[PDB]
Ligand binder design. Structure first.
Ligand SMILES: [Zn+2]
Ligand SMILES: [Zn+2]
Length: 80
């Protein structure tokens, strides 16, 4: 049987953990609220949040359209 088991499922609201990587909150990458939105798995890792912002190409929320919190120090690269 060169086939494994897997289907469509979603982790219940038993424990609050990252929604992007789905891992335990670390001291440096603790589950923090990027916006007002609360309840659901809206708790992403301070770092992870970035990776998502890059891919999704979005800085603020999708609904509340609130700017996420990303430790910024230097302007760095930008669109231009
Ligand atoms: Zn994460
Ligand atoms: Zn939001």
């Amino acid at each position: 049987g060169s086939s494994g088991s897997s289907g469509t499922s979603i982790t219940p609201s038993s424990q609050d953990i990252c929604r992007i990587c789905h891992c335990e909150g670390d001291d440096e990458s603790p589950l923090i609220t990027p916006c007002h939105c609360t309840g659901s798995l809206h708790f992403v890792h301070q770092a992870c949040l970035q990776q998502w912002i890059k891919s999704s190409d979005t800085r603020c929320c999708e609904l509340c359209k609130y700017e996420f919190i990303m430790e910024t120090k230097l302007s760095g690269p930008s669109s231009g």
